[PDB]
Ligand binder design. Structure first.
Ligand SMILES: *[C@@H]1O[C@H](CO)[C@@H](O[C@@H]2O[C@H](CO)[C@@H](O[C@@H]3O[C@H](CO[C@H]4O[C@H](CO)[C@@H](O)[C@H](O)[C@@H]4O)[C@@H](O)[C@H](O[C@H]4O[C@H](CO)[C@@H](O)[C@H](O)[C@@H]4O)[C@@H]3O)[C@H](O)[C@H]2NC(C)=O)[C@H](O)[C@H]1NC(C)=O
Lengths: 112, 128
């Protein structure tokens, strides 16, 4: 998993959590394109972000993405209970395949 | 799209399998076919990015010469919503290759975000 994440993310109901995804300079984000995915283990994933911040069709504007010179971030607000899934960040170039990274569980603390 | 996969299969080690998925309701030629493995022990690994419109293929470096991907021609159910099929042949399966296989449709026809998977099927369980 050359594209490394933090593997420990938690947020509270109604607040906003942030998830990071960084890696080396050979598999990076400044010179790459970043896409984000919601992947519950056992089910088929779902697209959120494709180019680097552009939002996929059928995603509430509560999601967004930003890209620094060394890491990429997503800021998820309004954490409903259904956000307890796992997100895998994807680094892809225009003329080559994506390099999926490790996996980060997200925990919605304070649910019922 | 409503991608439908072949279904789960059980098989002895040291051999080859052909896994196929049948597209419906979207033109098959326009959007890339994106073949994927999720090994529960290893997490997610990429397999291939075949274009169904030409012979253009792209493959991950870890699986060169080990897997051969091909596609059928489409059948026109009606204009702009056809039906077509794609399959991959994986030589020399091992224990390491015990997980869920998905094929997916490319996000866009043009632009920098092509070759990116949007629609995913239910998938098949390979046990080896
Ligand atoms: C009929 O319809 C099909 C499918 O819709 C069209 O084929 C698509 O054409 C587009 C535009 O050319 C393709 O998008 C481009 O793909 C390239 C990736 O392939 C390259 O790399 C592989 C490596 O294996 C080579 O085999 C291959 O020959 C190519 O070299 C990229 O190079 C392109 O990126 C460029 O353009 C984008 C556009 O914004 C820029 O952002 C990039 O910076 C860069 O300049 C581009 O992404 C698309 O992949 C094709 N799809 C399929 C499924 O093949 C046909 O063109 C169309 N035919 C007619 C006659 O209209």
């Amino acid at each position: 998993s050359v594209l490394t994440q933090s593997a420990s993310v938690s947020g509270s109901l109604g607040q906003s959590v942030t998830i990071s995804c960084t890696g080396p300079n050979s598999v990076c984000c400044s010179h790459k394109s970043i896409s984000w995915y919601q992947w519950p283990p056992g089910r088929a994933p779902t697209l959120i972000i494709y180019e680097d911040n552009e939002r996929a069709p059928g995603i509430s504007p509560r999601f967004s993405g930003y890209k620094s010179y060394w890491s990429a971030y997503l800021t998820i607000s309004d954490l409903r209970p259904e956000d307890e899934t796992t997100y895998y960040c994807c680094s892809y170039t225009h003329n080559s395949g994506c390099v999926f990274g490790t996996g980060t569980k997200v925990s919605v603390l304070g649910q019922s | 799209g409503q991608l439908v996969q072949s279904g789960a299969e059980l098989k002895k080690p040291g051999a080859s399998v052909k896994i196929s998925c049948k597209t419906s309701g979207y033109r098959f030629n326009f959007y890339h076919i994106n073949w994927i493995r999720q090994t529960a022990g290893r997490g997610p690994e990429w397999m291939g990015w075949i274009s169904p419109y030409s012979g253009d293929k792209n493959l991950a470096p870890a699986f060169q010469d080990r897997v051969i991907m091909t596609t059928d021609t489409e059948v026109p159910v009606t204009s702009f919503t056809s039906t077509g099929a794609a399959y991959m042949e994986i030589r020399n399966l091992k224990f390491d290759d015990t997980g869920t296989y998905f094929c997916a449709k490319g996000l866009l026809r043009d632009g920098s975000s092509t070759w990116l998977p949007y629609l995913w099927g239910q998938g098949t369980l390979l046990t080896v």
